[PDB]
Amino acid sequence: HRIRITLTSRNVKSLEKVCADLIRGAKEKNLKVKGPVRMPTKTLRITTRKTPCGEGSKTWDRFQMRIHKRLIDLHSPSEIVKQITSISIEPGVEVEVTIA
Amino acid sequence: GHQQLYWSHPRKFGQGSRSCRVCSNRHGLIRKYGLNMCRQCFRQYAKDIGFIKLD
C-alpha cells in the first residue's frame, strides 16, 4: 500500500495544477496523504557558439532546460490511484506511480 | 572478395562513425544527453526539444 505518485514535469504551473488535483481528489475518500515533496530541480546546460561558421566575436548561447520532480506518498488500496490519476491529464507532467 | 573490404575499417569508436541525426556530418556534435546532433542543427530545434534562453 506504499503508493508513490512520481510527478516529473518540464513546466512549473502544470505540475502545480496536477499535484493540487491529486490532493483535492484524495481527501473526500478520507485517506491520509503526505504533502507533495519537492526534489531539487535539474537544469540541463548546452553552450553553443551561435555562429554556423567560426567567424565574428566568440559569443555563446546558454540553453537551459529546467526539470522538476515531485513525489506524493499515498496510504490507499492499489485500485483508487487508477481512478483519480486517469482524470484531468495535461501533457506537461509525466504522472508515474510506484506500487511498493 | 569485394564485400569483405568495402566497410572493413572498425566503426566501434572515433568521430568518423557517430554523426548528426539531421545532417550526417561529423563536426560540432552534441553527444551530451544523446542529442547526437550538430551544434548548427541543435540551434535550429532548441525551442522544439524544450530548451529555452532565460539566462
Binding site: 540541463l44 | 544527453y33 530545434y45 522544439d48 524544450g50
Partner: peptide, 19 residues
C-alpha cells in the same frame, strides 16, 4: 523499461521526437 533511460534523457529523446 528494459534499457531504463534517465529522466535527464527522457525529456531529450521525447523533445527530439516532438521536433
Amino acid at each position: 523499461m528494459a534499457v531504463q533511460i534517465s529522466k535527464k534523457r527522457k525529456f531529450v529523446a521525447d523533445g527530439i521526437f516532438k521536433a
